[PDB]
Ligand binder design. Structure first.
Ligand SMILES: Nc1nc2c(ncn2[C@@H]2O[C@H](COP(=O)(O)OP(=O)(O)OP(=O)(O)O)[C@@H](O)[C@H]2O)c(=O)[nH]1
Ligand SMILES: Nc1nc2c(ncn2[C@@H]2O[C@H](COP(=O)(O)OP(=O)(O)O)[C@@H](O)[C@H]2O)c(=O)[nH]1
Ligand SMILES: Nc1nc2c(ncn2[C@@H]2O[C@H](COP(=O)(O)OP(=O)(O)O)[C@@H](O)[C@H]2O)c(=O)[nH]1
Ligand SMILES: [Mg+2]
Lengths: 32, 35, 409, 426, 426
């Protein structure tokens, strides 16, 4: 059960990081 | 069982994404001077 | 004197469905059009909308050609597999249309290069027309895909593979995007939510303004053979930016004071080009100005002087007389349900420059990226193609880029 | 003109197809007695794609029901829109496989597949320009999966140029009805990767989850789930049946969403889907349809697309709408969420617009994303398959029927090499 | 174009917001069904600020209800104008905090606030140009104070460049509904001074005083209190919805009334507010609105400003008025009582006029004063906080949830230096 919690935490962190990355990419496109 | 390998894949991918995020912050900070 | 029009594809005959509506509404002057047309497509759905539409009796039943099944956004399918059975029937009709004619100025073709029918059998029709007549002009008003606004996925493959034949087959090729026209309808026509119908209506305005010299008597007439000399300085450089003025609504038109000086200016700003490209990066090789309606030669003469003396735009070092004017007396007509107000006078400008060299370069990367990983290539190869023609069409556009850079210097 | 022959297999296929012919017959305005009674002219000129005029205005569907148990046939014949089929088309065995893939693929199929092929051939050449076949079946059952899969292989041998759609449901461990689900689904996929043209993957978790969260139904029986699947199937072949400002047939969608020949497993979604209590609290615009389309909690598969990247995507719109709004919305989602899309492919979204909405609605949409998140289920299945096959559970029920150990190893091999190629292209 | 998204938290927030949406919808001529039935074209020009057109005249409010117990949600849908809210905007927990700021800020907030954030995101991106957010809540309760304050902090780090109003009633010893009021108020104010752009102090004691003397009501239920608060909220944002001779937007008010980033606690009053027995004997001119505005017994807080000094003040007038009269009245009340005003700022009063009165009156006004006397509440609350915390009363319900002791000491220090810093500029 412990490893299951690790899975559902790492994906959520991974998801937040991917969303931040998209924001940065969008800003570069607008600024260029 | 197989979740033990899933945690490795997810951990390594998360760390690599941080490296991409870091480089992108320098890129936008570099263009902001040129503006 | 007559000129016949061919329409290919979903985009071609919808453009024609608006273009012929304008011709009938506009009309011995009719002799050049009355129709001398042919619709042809692989999908029967859009042609048979005409067969049951309001213009049932207007078109002779045979004219409306229609295949059995679509090429499905597949240049190879619409050029090698399915084209081979319908193209022969089409051109073996167009011949007897020309035999009906006596003083044929030329043909004019309408196609979009993104699709399979507009691109594939477009080029196939063009190749048998060039070997059959050769000398007679074939004006091709094509619709290239926009850089950022796009509806398909494999359209880079189609656009490159279509262009390789559009070079050495058509005589005068006018680019038209969809984003640029969308921007025109958003900016000037203030239509925030446009559809394909509005685009096709103002495309017909451009076509009508360049054939009105044959149809009606003006102060300075200009035939289709005239564009052949006055705008193409080299046999393989014929790609024309288009523009129109005044594109204006029904209320704004009355408020503003339309004249010759300001519309000659408005037809030169990149905020009014029919192709998404910035001619500030390029240098004008030649310009052509069709004036319709209430025009005396003095103010058109004065207007080209002010353009030459401005420095916001530049010309090539080769042409001091870099213009070709043309004046016709009859004003542009309006369509009920159309958005363009009635104007005493309008200007359709067709230029040639090196800004077009940017669109091909922009196109190259998108095609290059997909081709390197061999995306979607298995569809075209199983249709009948090989890796040879992909790579060789690629290097043809590479040569064209160097060509524009060399001539522009 | 273009022709679609319908083939339904098994209990799942028959009941899904029953609801399908209900909604298509209403769209074309045909009564339960078989006669035309519609109002608009538009509904007449394109009924040959799905029907055949028999005599006295009798339009019979071009369908083939196929199973091994008579309960499904009698339930079909009992209900409304049950007396519109030709009784000769109810090709029907008698013994029954019963969740044994070997029975439905080697023993019992061997005496039925001859009769179905006779009917489908006579029904195929009855029309002039075939567009393709349309199959609805499952991958957990035996007579649906095994016989339907064998029928797919034989059909692709005879007609190798014609198109092929397969609406197949796959089993998931959260909704696990039979015990031998992995043994069936793994072998079934082995044949689907080489025989079908494209497969629109379905599942019951997402369907039950959709009716809970978005539809907020209280008792979602199979009728409502089959109603949703039918609405998807009507949306995918609306372009043939009705004129539009931009048409996209079956072949047109296939070439724009399949970048490599083995990458033909799709995810599906339908919009708009709103609760009955909130149907009047909403607008009907293109942006609203797009927000509900690209929601990851709206696919009809239990595979979150945000767990991977989209290779391509497709949006079929129905209704009077502006094409500019269509392209701007697709471009907007392509720029803001840049990481979820593949990079060496620009324009991962093909779009199309038809001018006739489904009955009762103003504007609808159908999404078909070919993503690389679909590989999780194949891994999600293969781990179960190995769990049984490491220790030969239930294996003799198939071994004493003809399958040898190499067949299961081959099925594992094909499953494993497939999940690697999805991982490769991500 | 300029847009306000509305957020209601807890039981206090739900009743206040309920009577608020009735008042605005009645001003814009929208009936309980939610369809337009007004007459003037002027009422339609500025409905984008608070509503979205759904279909066929249906206007839905741009509000989000957020709580923890379903009694408030069902009481909202029961009453009139209850059928206008979109049911999806009822984002909602199930367990209940119950007057425990730690339960409202650490345990139940951590799983509800992601949901309320997602609704707010959709509501913010659904519109084009945000003017600000509007949050109504209390400071004594738990599900309003702790959760709402966490929502404020989360939103401020998301959209940092937009305004934000929060209308908060605060506890007082004379109206003491719960026992841990100071432990909730002190921690809530600590977060408000560092997150919110501007706050509007309210209390229930002053509202009861208003209903006794000015309204002369027999039975002042909560409906009338919410009626007064709603009239104030409509009065301040009237400038964005209607044109006038001198328009003053929310940002224009914020920069004109806040001299220093920590001095953003205002006391509010509204005029005219008269009993039905004396409403017949009254006149409607500018001086009668002012001398009822600037009366100390009309403020909606129990902080008498003449026990302090005015920094700045503002009046928002509604109705066809003469701007000369408006300015000379502000001049008169500032010249006579010069001691009550700050000295190093001349012309302490910002004034504005709008040309649309509320229905039922010919001329009205709304007063917003940023005095320094608001520190009476801070000392008045902090001593009760100290009286329990010196002796560790009720502490374990806060401590055993995740909070430690330095949180209370830091909160004490920040509240204490805040009242100290108000006193220095005084
Ligand atoms: N201006 C304009 N462009 C159109 C219109 N219809 C389609 N297009 C363009 O056509 C391109 C695709 O080709 P289509 O004409 O739709 O289809 P096709 O050329 O007949 O090829 P197939 O789909 O295989 O039949 C798209 O990129 C559109 O931009 C139209 O009505 N007006
Ligand atoms: N959506 C839907 N799924 C069904 C229906 N009937 C059966 N299923 C699914 O089919 C699977 C069993 O397939 P089965 O009916 O035994 O196939 P068959 O025996 O080969 O005909 C189960 O997982 C069910 O969830 C139905 O009417 N609708
Ligand atoms: N003005 C007004 N105040 C209210 C109303 N209902 C509750 N309150 C106030 O709310 C305070 C208690 O907060 P509570 O409702 O328990 O907040 P919550 O539990 O966090 O939602 C009391 O001091 C009341 O004065 C109302 O209808 N109007
Ligand atoms: Mg087409």
């Amino acid at each position: 059960e412990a490893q299951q919690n690790d899975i559902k935490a790492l994906r959520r962190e991974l998801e937040l990081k991917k969303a931040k990355l998209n924001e940065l990419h969008e800003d570069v496109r607008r600024k260029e | 069982p197989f979740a033990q390998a899933l945690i490795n894949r997810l951990q390594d991918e998360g760390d690599m994404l941080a490296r991409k995020i870091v480089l992108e912050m320098r890129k936008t900070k570099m263009l902001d001077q040129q503006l | 004197r007559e000129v016949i029009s061919i329409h290919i594809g979903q985009a071609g005959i919808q453009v024609g469905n608006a273009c012929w509506e304008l011709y009938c509404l506009e009309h011995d002057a009719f002799n050049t059009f009355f129709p001398r047309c042919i619709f042809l497509d692989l999908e029967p759905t859009v042609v048979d909308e005409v067969r049951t539409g309001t213009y049932r009796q207007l078109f002779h039943p045979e004219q409306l050609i229609s295949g059995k099944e679509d090429a499905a956004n597949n240049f190879a399918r619409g050029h090698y597999t399915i084209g081979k059975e319908i193209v022969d029937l089409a051109l073996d009709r167009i011949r007897k249309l020309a035999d009906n004619c006596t003083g044929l100025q030329g043909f004019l073709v309408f196609n979009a290069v993104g699709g399979g029918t507009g691109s594939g059998l477009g080029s196939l029709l063009l190749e048998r027309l060039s070997v059959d007549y050769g000398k007679k002009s074939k004006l091709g008003f094509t619709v290239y895909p926009s850089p950022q606004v796009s509806t398909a996925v494999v359209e880079p493959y189609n656009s490159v593979l279509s262009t390789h034949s559009l070079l050495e087959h058509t005589d005068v090729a006018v680019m038209l995007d969809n984003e640029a026209i969308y921007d025109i309808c958003r900016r000037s026509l203030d239509i925030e939510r446009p559809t394909y119908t509005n685009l096709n209506r103002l495309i017909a305005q451009v076509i009508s303004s360049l054939t009105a010299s044959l149809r009606f008597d003006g102060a300075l007439n200009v035939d289709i053979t005239e564009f052949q000399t006055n705008l193409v300085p080299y046999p393989r450089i014929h790609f024309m930016l288009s523009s129109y003025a005044p594109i204006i609504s029904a209320e704004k038109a009355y408020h503003e004071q339309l004249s010759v000086a300001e519309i000659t200016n408005a037809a030169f700003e990149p905020a009014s080009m029919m192709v998404k490209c910035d001619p500030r990066h390029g240098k004008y090789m030649a310009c052509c100005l069709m004036y319709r309606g209430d025009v005396v030669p003095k103010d058109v003469n004065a207007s080209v002087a002010t353009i030459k003396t401005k420095r916001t735009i530049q010309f090539v070092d080769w042409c001091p007389t870099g213009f070709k004017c043309g004046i016709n007396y009859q004003p542009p007509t309006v369509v009920p349900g159309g958005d363009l107000a009635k104007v005493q006078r309008a200007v359709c400008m067709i230029s040639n420059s090196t800004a077009i060299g940017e669109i091909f370069s922009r196109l190259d990367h998108k095609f290059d990226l997909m081709y390197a990983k061999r995306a979607f290539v298995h569809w075209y190869v199983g249709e009948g193609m090989e890796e040879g023609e992909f790579s060789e069409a690629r290097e043809d556009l590479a040569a064209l880029e160097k060509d524009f850079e060399e001539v522009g210097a | 003109m273009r022709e679609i022959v319908h083939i339904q297999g098994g209990q799942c296929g028959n009941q899904i197809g029953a609801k399908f012919w209900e909604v298509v017959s209403d769209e074309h305005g045909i009564d339960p007695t078989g006669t035309y009674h519609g109002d608009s002219d538009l509904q007449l000129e394109r009924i040959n794609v799905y029907f055949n005029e028999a005599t006295g205005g009798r339009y019979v569907p071009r369908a083939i029901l196929m199973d091994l148990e008579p309960g499904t046939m009698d339930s079909v014949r009992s209900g409304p829109y049950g007396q519109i089929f030709r009784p000769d088309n109810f090709v029907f065995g008698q013994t029954g496989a019963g969740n044994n893939w070997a029975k439905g693929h080697y023993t019992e199929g061997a005496e039925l597949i001859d009769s179905v092929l006779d009917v489908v051939r006579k029904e195929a050449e009855s029309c002039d320009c075939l567009q393709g076949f349309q199959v609805c079946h499952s991958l957990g059952g035996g007579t649906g999966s095994g016989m339907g899969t064998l029928l797919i292989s034989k059909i692709r041998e005879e007609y190798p140029d014609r198109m092929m759609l397969t609406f197949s449901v796959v089993p998931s461990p959260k909704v696990s009805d039979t015990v031998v689900e992995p043994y069936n689904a793994t072998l079934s996929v082995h044949q689907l990767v080489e025989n079908a043209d494209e497969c629109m993957v379905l599942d019951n978790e997402a369907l039950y989850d959709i009716c809970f969260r978005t539809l907020k139904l209280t008792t979602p029986t199979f009728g409502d789930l089959n109603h949703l699947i039918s609405a998807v199937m009507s949306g995918i072949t609306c372009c043939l049946r009705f004129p539009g400002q931009l048409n996209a047939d079956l072949r047109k969608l296939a070439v724009n969403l399949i970048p490599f020949p083995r990458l033909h497993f799709f995810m599906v979604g339908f919009t708009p889907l709103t609760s009955r209590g909130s149907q009047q609290y909403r607008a009907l615009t293109v942006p609203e349809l797009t927000q509900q389309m690209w929601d990851a909690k709206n696919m009809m598969c239990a595979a979150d697309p945000r767990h991977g990247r989209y290779l391509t995507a497709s949006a079929l719109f129905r209704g009077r709408m502006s094409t500019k709004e269509v392209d701007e919305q697709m471009l907007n989602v392509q720029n803001k969420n840049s990481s979820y899309f593949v990079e060496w492919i620009p324009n991962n979204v093909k779009s199309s617009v038809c001018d006739i909405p489904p009955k009762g609605l103003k504007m609808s949409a159908t999404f078909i994303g070919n993503s690389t998140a679909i590989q999780e289920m194949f891994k999600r299945v293969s781990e179960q398959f190995t769990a049984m096959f490491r220790r030969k559970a239930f294996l003799h029920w198939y071994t004493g029927e003809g399958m040898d150990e190499m067949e299961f190893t081959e099925a594992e091999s094909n499953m494993n090499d497939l999940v690697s190629e999805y991982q490769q292209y991500q």
